[PDB]
Amino acid sequence: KTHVQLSLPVLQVRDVLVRGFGDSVEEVLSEARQHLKDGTCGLVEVEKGVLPQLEQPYVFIKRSDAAPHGHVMVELVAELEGIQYGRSGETLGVLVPHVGEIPVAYRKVLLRK
């Protein structure tokens, strides 16, 4: 399918053990896509002081439509030294590996894969 229905565990930034997906824009988008497919992807909600606690390049999920079965349609945008790779809507959060952290909530998304 072109789109996949996911529920992303929302993690507190101070709990996150692995604070990014890798060392290049291409690697982090690749890894984020793989983790999203394998159900091993978490979401950190972006507020004051959150991004400096995480590792660049960042992967954002961004609203791509203005929500089938409650799933907001999203796409991936990467960011390194203030340049973004992709163009989309409002940030829902930044993606990180999920390695067993206890979530605070779930975010239902429909991912353009």
Number of helices: 1
Structural class of the helix and strand makeup? mainly beta
- SSE ordering: EHEEEEEE
Biggest sheet descriptor: 7 strands, mixed
Question: In total, how many beta strands?
Answer: 7
CATH topology name, in short, is SH3 type barrels
- CATH class, anyone? Mainly Beta
Query: How much of the sequence is in beta strands?
Result: 35-45%
The CATH architecture designation is Roll
User: What's the Cα radius of gyration?
Assistant: 13 Å
**Morphology call:** globular
**Share of helical residues:** 10-25%
Distance between the termini: 8 Å
* Total individual domains: 1
Notes on the protein architecture:
Helix content is 12%, strand content 40%. It contains one helix and seven strands. Strands 1, 2, 3, 4, 5, 6 and 7 form a seven-stranded mixed β-sheet that branches. A hairpin with a 2-residue loop joins strand 4 and strand 5 (83-85).
List keywords for this structure.
113 residues; mainly beta; SH3 type barrels; 7-stranded mixed beta sheet; 12% helix; viral protein; SARS-CoV-2
Short characterization:
By secondary structure, this protein is mostly beta strands. 12% of the residues lie in helices and 40% in strands. It has a single domain, classed as Roll (SH3 type barrels), CATH 2.30.30.
List the helices and strands and how they pair.
Blueprint: E1 3-10, H1 25-38, E2 41-44, E3 58-63, E4 72-80, E5 83-85, E6 91-97, E7 105-112
Parallel strand pairs: 4-7
Antiparallel strand pairs: 1-7, 2-6, 3-4, 3-6, 4-5
